[PDB]
Amino acid sequence: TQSLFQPITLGALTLKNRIVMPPMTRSRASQPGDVANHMMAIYYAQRASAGLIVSEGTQISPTAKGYAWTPGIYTPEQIAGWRIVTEAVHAKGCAIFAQLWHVGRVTHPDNIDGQQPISSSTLKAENVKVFVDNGSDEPGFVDVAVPRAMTKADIAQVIADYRQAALNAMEAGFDGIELHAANGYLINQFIDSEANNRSDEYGGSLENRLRFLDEVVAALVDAIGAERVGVRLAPLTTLNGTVDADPILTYTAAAALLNKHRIVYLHIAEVDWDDAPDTPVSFKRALREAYQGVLIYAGRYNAEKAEQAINDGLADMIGFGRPFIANPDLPERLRHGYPLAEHVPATLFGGGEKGLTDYPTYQA
Ligand SMILES: Cc1cc2nc3c(=O)[nH]c(=O)nc-3n(C[C@H](O)[C@H](O)[C@H](O)COP(=O)(O)O)c2cc1C
């Protein structure tokens, strides 16, 4: 676990270790207004021994939301709410990036003011569910709705929303932003061939399928600087409905495209819940060559596997998701080999402090 506890430079930041708390939706935002709050600030501060914390997905607009009670980052109140979180995290000496989110077709009208979801095309995500607020504090799971294909105007609007969300994140005190272009959400809906049936310049060819990602990133970098922009991709998982015919070519190309933008880090979501596809070392090495910045991987890693990935030159940082939910002092436990508490699925989403800030630190 030696390399895991080595510091690392991320743009203008000098992080304490290679451990990342990956973005994890907890749906604890205050109502009404979907505002980041006090318990969330405590929650993130409790886990500030991580080298880097990436916030749970935060929607860039009212129609970018896919799940009940997730925090937004477009209203003044929402910005202020996030400010309390970043202040709390910074007081602990940690860095934190805001994950800018647009779920595209992975949502239900109930979560976006009755509006129809948008996507690259009119394809509904197959076998996918999200959850909504149904007059009770227990997530109500529902099938996603059929989306409408984005028009040129929609594309301009979403890019504008992303750009402003980035500025909003800086106003909120975040050290940077992470573009959620993974796990089957909006941008991923353009990237993957089987989810994109557009006949215009945003579909039909690899270059075209990567165009939206290219333009969104261009706007983000222009707004806050490449050193403060990270991007998350999911080349092989397909849990939320996005499948690409030639992932290796598509995502190696995506990595090269992002390298041109000099984004500060590329984050690969290697596992999504129980979707843990074989991710060839050869593929990981190709990504390492296509993208020369900081490479982060998350998905079923333990101390041994994380150390191995870094020592083999495949990754620079490793994110631990589920373990960080239940172990606020995960880094210390990983370093000492202390047993890890396990999280309770029933309290991952919704509710209050229980299952959020009451997982204790290790005590022999
Ligand atoms: C409660 C929960 C919510 C999640 N929500 C998000 C999210 O908001 N954004 C994202 O990119 N990944 C999301 N993830 C995926 C994680 O960031 C991570 O990639 C995944 O859990 C695999 O890592 P693990 O096996 O160490 O948990 C979520 C996972 C958990 C456990």
UniProtKB/TrEMBL annotation:
One of its GO terms (molecular function) is FMN binding. FMN binds at P23, T25, G57, Q99, R232, R300, G321, R322. One of its GO terms (cellular component) is cytosol. Keywords: Flavoprotein, FMN, Nucleotide-binding, Oxidoreductase. It holds the Pfam family Oxidored_FMN. Residues 3-339 form the NADH:flavin oxidoreductase/NADH oxidase N-terminal domain. The keyword Flavoprotein applies. Its cofactor is FMN. Belongs to the NADH:flavin oxidoreductase/NADH oxidase family. This is NADH:flavin oxidoreductase Sye1. It comes from Shewanella oneidensis (strain ATCC 700550 / JCM 31522 / CIP 106686 / LMG 19005 / NCIMB 14063 / MR-1).
